[PDB]
Protein backbone atom coordinates (compact mmCIF):
# COMPACT_ATOMS: atom_id res chain seq x y z
CA UNK A 1 0.00 0.00 0.00
CA UNK A 2 3.17 2.22 -0.15
CA UNK A 3 2.41 4.59 -3.13
CA UNK A 4 3.39 3.73 -6.77
CA UNK A 5 3.37 6.23 -9.69
CA UNK A 6 1.53 5.05 -12.87
CA UNK A 7 0.93 7.13 -16.06
CA UNK A 8 -2.64 6.70 -17.46
CA UNK A 9 -4.41 8.25 -20.50
CA UNK A 10 -7.87 9.91 -20.30
CA UNK A 11 -10.28 11.54 -22.76
CA UNK A 12 -9.85 15.33 -22.06
CA UNK A 13 -13.54 15.54 -20.91
CA UNK A 14 -13.11 12.73 -18.32
CA UNK A 15 -9.76 14.16 -17.03
CA UNK A 16 -11.42 17.63 -16.68
CA UNK A 17 -14.30 16.00 -14.67
CA UNK A 18 -11.81 14.11 -12.40
CA UNK A 19 -9.86 17.40 -11.90
CA UNK A 20 -13.04 19.34 -10.96
CA UNK A 21 -14.05 16.54 -8.49
CA UNK A 22 -10.54 16.65 -6.88
CA UNK A 23 -10.68 20.51 -6.56
CA UNK A 24 -14.24 20.41 -5.10
CA UNK A 25 -13.01 18.26 -2.12
CA UNK A 26 -9.55 20.06 -1.84
CA UNK A 27 -8.14 16.62 -2.83
CA UNK A 28 -5.45 15.18 -5.22
CA UNK A 29 -6.37 13.63 -8.63
CA UNK A 30 -5.02 10.22 -7.44
CA UNK A 31 -7.35 10.36 -4.41
CA UNK A 32 -10.54 10.85 -6.52
CA UNK A 33 -9.48 8.01 -8.90
CA UNK A 34 -8.75 5.76 -5.84
CA UNK A 35 -12.28 6.44 -4.45
CA UNK A 36 -13.75 5.55 -7.90
CA UNK A 37 -11.85 2.17 -7.89
CA UNK A 38 -13.23 1.39 -4.36
CA UNK A 39 -16.79 2.09 -5.70
CA UNK A 40 -16.33 0.14 -9.02
CA UNK A 41 -13.95 -2.72 -7.89
CA UNK A 42 -16.76 -5.26 -7.27
CA UNK A 43 -18.80 -4.75 -10.56
CA UNK A 44 -15.51 -4.96 -12.57
CA UNK A 45 -14.12 -8.11 -10.78
CA UNK A 46 -17.57 -9.86 -11.03
CA UNK A 47 -17.86 -9.33 -14.81
CA UNK A 48 -16.68 -12.46 -16.69
CA UNK A 49 -13.52 -12.58 -18.86
CA UNK A 50 -15.19 -11.41 -22.10
CA UNK A 51 -12.74 -13.33 -24.41
CA UNK A 52 -12.40 -16.60 -22.32
CA UNK A 53 -15.03 -19.38 -23.01
CA UNK A 54 -15.19 -20.20 -19.21
CA UNK A 55 -14.86 -16.47 -18.26
CA UNK B 1 -12.15 13.16 -25.76
CA UNK B 2 -8.77 13.03 -27.64
CA UNK B 3 -6.48 11.14 -25.13
CA UNK B 4 -4.40 12.98 -22.43
CA UNK B 5 -1.57 11.37 -20.38
CA UNK B 6 -1.78 11.89 -16.57
CA UNK B 7 0.57 10.37 -13.91
CA UNK B 8 -1.34 9.06 -10.83
CA UNK B 9 -0.13 7.33 -7.61
CA UNK B 10 -1.68 4.08 -6.26
CA UNK B 11 -1.15 1.85 -3.22
CA UNK B 12 0.79 -1.19 -4.65
CA UNK B 13 -2.17 -3.51 -3.74
CA UNK B 14 -4.71 -1.37 -5.68
CA UNK B 15 -2.38 -0.99 -8.73
CA UNK B 16 -1.83 -4.81 -8.73
CA UNK B 17 -5.66 -5.32 -8.67
CA UNK B 18 -6.17 -2.80 -11.55
CA UNK B 19 -3.37 -4.58 -13.52
CA UNK B 20 -4.96 -8.04 -12.99
CA UNK B 21 -8.41 -6.66 -14.08
CA UNK B 22 -6.82 -5.14 -17.27
CA UNK B 23 -5.03 -8.48 -18.09
CA UNK B 24 -8.23 -10.52 -17.47
CA UNK B 25 -10.09 -8.58 -20.25
CA UNK B 26 -6.95 -8.28 -22.56
CA UNK B 27 -7.32 -4.52 -21.90
CA UNK B 28 -5.05 -1.49 -21.05
CA UNK B 29 -4.72 -0.13 -17.46
CA UNK B 30 -6.24 3.22 -18.59
CA UNK B 31 -9.30 1.38 -19.96
CA UNK B 32 -10.09 -0.39 -16.61
CA UNK B 33 -9.66 2.94 -14.69
CA UNK B 34 -11.94 4.69 -17.27
CA UNK B 35 -14.67 2.02 -16.73
CA UNK B 36 -14.35 2.54 -12.92
CA UNK B 37 -14.88 6.35 -13.36
CA UNK B 38 -18.04 5.70 -15.48
CA UNK B 39 -19.36 3.44 -12.63
CA UNK B 40 -18.38 5.86 -9.76
CA UNK B 41 -18.88 9.30 -11.47
CA UNK B 42 -22.43 9.82 -10.12
CA UNK B 43 -21.83 8.86 -6.39
CA UNK B 44 -18.69 11.11 -6.36
CA UNK B 45 -20.37 14.17 -8.07
CA UNK B 46 -23.48 13.83 -5.79
CA UNK B 47 -21.44 13.86 -2.55
CA UNK B 48 -21.34 17.40 -1.07
CA UNK B 49 -18.17 19.53 -0.85
CA UNK B 50 -16.99 18.20 2.54
CA UNK B 51 -15.17 21.49 3.52
CA UNK B 52 -17.76 24.04 2.14
CA UNK B 53 -20.64 25.07 4.52
CA UNK B 54 -23.15 25.03 1.55
CA UNK B 55 -21.44 21.95 -0.03
CA UNK C 1 -5.29 -20.64 -21.12
CA UNK C 2 -2.76 -17.76 -20.59
CA UNK C 3 0.97 -18.20 -19.61
CA UNK C 4 3.33 -15.25 -18.74
CA UNK C 5 6.66 -14.95 -20.70
CA UNK C 6 9.33 -12.20 -20.24
CA UNK C 7 10.91 -11.06 -23.57
CA UNK C 8 13.47 -8.32 -24.52
CA UNK C 9 12.69 -5.39 -26.88
CA UNK C 10 14.74 -2.44 -28.14
CA UNK C 11 13.25 0.66 -26.36
CA UNK C 12 12.02 2.08 -29.75
CA UNK C 13 10.10 -1.15 -30.62
CA UNK C 14 8.61 -1.46 -27.06
CA UNK C 15 7.46 2.23 -27.29
CA UNK C 16 5.83 1.48 -30.73
CA UNK C 17 4.04 -1.65 -29.35
CA UNK C 18 2.85 0.46 -26.35
CA UNK C 19 1.47 3.26 -28.64
CA UNK C 20 -0.38 0.61 -30.76
CA UNK C 21 -1.87 -0.95 -27.54
CA UNK C 22 -2.97 2.56 -26.29
CA UNK C 23 -4.54 3.44 -29.70
CA UNK C 24 -6.94 0.40 -29.43
CA UNK C 25 -7.42 0.74 -25.57
CA UNK C 26 -5.68 -2.70 -25.49
CA UNK C 27 -3.00 -4.57 -23.43
CA UNK C 28 0.63 -5.00 -24.67
CA UNK C 29 0.14 -8.82 -24.76
CA UNK C 30 -2.94 -8.38 -27.00
CA UNK C 31 -1.03 -6.29 -29.65
CA UNK C 32 1.85 -8.85 -29.68
CA UNK C 33 -0.65 -11.77 -29.97
CA UNK C 34 -2.31 -10.12 -33.02
CA UNK C 35 1.20 -9.62 -34.59
CA UNK C 36 1.97 -13.40 -34.20
CA UNK C 37 -1.37 -14.27 -35.90
CA UNK C 38 -0.48 -11.89 -38.82
CA UNK C 39 3.21 -12.97 -39.17
CA UNK C 40 2.97 -16.74 -38.33
CA UNK C 41 3.17 -17.86 -42.03
CA UNK C 42 6.19 -15.64 -43.11
CA UNK C 43 8.02 -16.80 -39.89
CA UNK C 44 7.28 -20.56 -40.49
CA UNK C 45 8.38 -20.25 -44.19
CA UNK C 46 11.74 -18.46 -43.74
CA UNK C 47 14.63 -20.93 -43.75
CA UNK C 48 16.34 -23.03 -40.98
CA UNK D 1 18.94 -0.64 -26.43
CA UNK D 2 16.99 -3.65 -25.01
CA UNK D 3 14.15 -3.69 -22.37
CA UNK D 4 12.65 -6.81 -20.64
CA UNK D 5 8.78 -6.92 -20.80
CA UNK D 6 6.48 -9.60 -19.23
CA UNK D 7 3.69 -10.68 -21.68
CA UNK D 8 0.81 -13.22 -21.58
CA UNK D 9 0.26 -15.93 -24.27
CA UNK D 10 -2.26 -18.75 -24.73
CA UNK D 11 -0.18 -21.93 -24.07
CA UNK D 12 -0.75 -23.18 -27.68
CA UNK D 13 0.57 -19.94 -29.24
CA UNK D 14 3.60 -19.76 -26.85
CA UNK D 15 4.40 -23.45 -27.74
CA UNK D 16 4.22 -22.49 -31.50
CA UNK D 17 6.54 -19.45 -30.90
CA UNK D 18 8.94 -21.76 -28.98
CA UNK D 19 9.01 -24.41 -31.78
CA UNK D 20 9.69 -21.65 -34.40
CA UNK D 21 12.55 -20.19 -32.23
CA UNK D 22 14.14 -23.71 -31.82
CA UNK D 23 13.84 -24.46 -35.60
CA UNK D 24 15.98 -21.35 -36.48
CA UNK D 25 18.39 -21.69 -33.43
CA UNK D 26 16.86 -18.32 -32.36
CA UNK D 27 15.69 -16.77 -29.02
CA UNK D 28 11.93 -16.38 -28.23
CA UNK D 29 12.40 -12.55 -28.11
CA UNK D 30 13.92 -12.60 -31.62
CA UNK D 31 10.96 -14.46 -33.28
CA UNK D 32 8.43 -12.13 -31.53
CA UNK D 33 10.47 -9.06 -32.69
CA UNK D 34 10.43 -10.36 -36.33
CA UNK D 35 6.60 -10.87 -36.04
CA UNK D 36 6.22 -7.17 -34.97
CA UNK D 37 8.39 -6.03 -37.96
CA UNK D 38 6.14 -8.08 -40.34
CA UNK D 39 2.77 -7.06 -38.75
CA UNK D 40 3.60 -3.40 -37.72
CA UNK D 41 2.08 -1.86 -40.90
CA UNK D 42 -1.26 -3.87 -41.00
CA UNK D 43 -1.70 -3.05 -37.25
CA UNK D 44 -0.87 0.72 -37.59
CA UNK D 45 -3.11 1.01 -40.73
CA UNK D 46 -6.18 -0.54 -39.03
CA UNK D 47 -8.31 2.32 -37.61
CA UNK D 48 -8.73 3.17 -33.88
CA UNK D 49 -11.68 0.76 -33.45
CA UNK D 50 -13.33 2.81 -30.58
CA UNK D 51 -12.66 6.38 -31.94
CA UNK D 52 -15.23 7.89 -34.42
CA UNK D 53 -12.38 9.81 -36.27
CA UNK D 54 -10.40 6.50 -36.30
Numbering used by the authors:
A (entry chain C), B (entry chain C): 4 to 58
C (entry chain B): 5 to 52
D (entry chain A): 5 to 58
From the paper:
Consistently, c-di-GMP and DNA binding are mutually exclusive. In vivo CdbA is essential, while CdbB is not, and depletion of CdbA causes defects in chromosome organization and segregation resulting in defects in cell division. CdbA is abundant and binds globally to the M. xanthus chromosome.
This form has three copies of the protein in the asymmetric unit, one of which forms a tetramer via crystallographic symmetry (four copies of same chain) and two of which form a dimer within the asymmetric unit, which then tetramerizes over the final crystallographic axis. The tetramer centers on residue F50 of the two innermost chains, and the C-terminal tails can be traced five residues further than in form one, and with the C-terminal tail of the innermost chains in a dimer contacting an opposing dimer. The arrangement of the two dimers in the tetramer places their β-sheets ~35 Å apart (measured between Cα atoms of equivalent Y12 residues). Because the β-sheets are ~35 Å apart in CdbA, this model suggests that CdbA bends DNA upon binding.
